[PDB]
Amino acid sequence: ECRLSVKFKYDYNMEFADAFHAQVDKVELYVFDKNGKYLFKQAEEGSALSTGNYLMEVELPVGQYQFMAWAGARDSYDITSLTPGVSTLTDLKLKLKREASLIINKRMETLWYGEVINVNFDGTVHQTETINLIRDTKIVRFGFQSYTGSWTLDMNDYDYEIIESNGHLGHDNSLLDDDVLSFRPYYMEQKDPATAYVDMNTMRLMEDRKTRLVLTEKASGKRVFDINLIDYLAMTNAEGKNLSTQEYLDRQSNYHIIFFLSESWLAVQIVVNGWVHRIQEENQ
């Protein structure tokens, strides 16, 4: 007669505060048993989640379970379909959809990973479990300007890519083996050459990856800029906070980076969300 409820939170962000009700409009809870065998999933989405008091009511027999979730997953992603009593956690995988070209140029609906929890429900009390959500999709606005302003960098001369094989996530949120994808702008603006920017997005930024930002000249097809974005972000100060690289990468999901370049396409300095950082030539 007692009921088991699930609370979802999204406080693992740079505001260190829960933004679930404000940002997450779909949760899908996966339930596995004592043995790690899949039992079912349960999806809810829409206005219910926005109240500030959303709880998911989960009908479950007395017993021990593991829960995890994916939140926000809609048309951009294929999540494997599991068979009750047959499949286990390691069967659950999420893959960003791509065509043969391996180019992604759409803005994906924001994706959150719900960490795995052990749940022991004996039916004697009303109980609420909490799912903790980690943002996996990362939005970046890039600007490119002359450091001395002695030449005008024109942003429509080039193509822009973020290159990584981060499009296949396991049940533990780890990057599975996958093809390397080319993430390219979903929006570009050069109204004021000083205003000018491209908006891009990618999947998880990992401290142990070497995710690349690559610019290619339309005219020649020559690559003019090729940097390790993870490394450029690691060199920074996590926006003044006391964070490990991975924690900053997980917590922050909007990155507005201006590159101030030499005439020879060397980054002299970058500005990441307002923070100025000199790039040491040896680490360019």
Residue numbers in the entry: 34 to 317
Published text:
The BT1062 gene of B. thetaiotaomicron encodes a predicted lipoprotein with a molecular weight of 36 535 Da (residues 1–317) and a calculated isoelectric point of 4.8. BT1062 is a member of a functionally uncharacterized protein family [Pfam PF08842 or DUF1812 (domain of unknown function family 1812)] consisting of ∼80 Bacteroidetes proteins of around 300–400 residues. Therefore, the BT1062–BT1068 genes are most likely to encode a fimbriae (or pili) system similar to that of the minor fimbriae of P. gingivalis, with BT1062 being equivalent to mfa2. Thus, DUF1812 is a collection of diverse proteins that are likely to be fimbrial components.
The selenomethionine derivative of BT1062 (residues 23–317) with an N-terminal His tag was expressed in E. coli and purified by metal-affinity chromatography. The crystal structure of BT1062 was determined in the tetragonal space group P41212 at 2.2 Å resolution using the MAD method. The structure of BT1062 consists of a tandem repeat of two domains: I (34–170) and II (171–317). BT1062 is composed of 21 β-strands (β1–β21), three α-helices (α1–α3) and five 310-helices. BT1062 is likely to exist as a monomer in solution, which is consistent with crystal-packing analysis and analytical size-exclusion chromatography. The most significant additional structural feature of BT1062 is a small β-sheet at the domain boundary formed by the EF loop of domain I and the BC loop of domain II. Domain II contains a three-helix insertion between strands F and G as well as a β-hairpin attachment (β20–β21) at the C-terminus. Most sequence homologs of BT1062 and Mfa2 contain two highly conserved cysteines at the N-terminus (Cys25 and Cys35) located near the tip of the bilobal molecule. The conformation of the peptide between the two conserved cysteines is likely to be flexible since residues 24–33 are exposed to solvent and disordered in the crystal with no interpretable electron density. The most conserved surface residues of BT1062 homologs correspond to a short sequence motif 306N(G/D)W308 located in the β20–β21 loop.
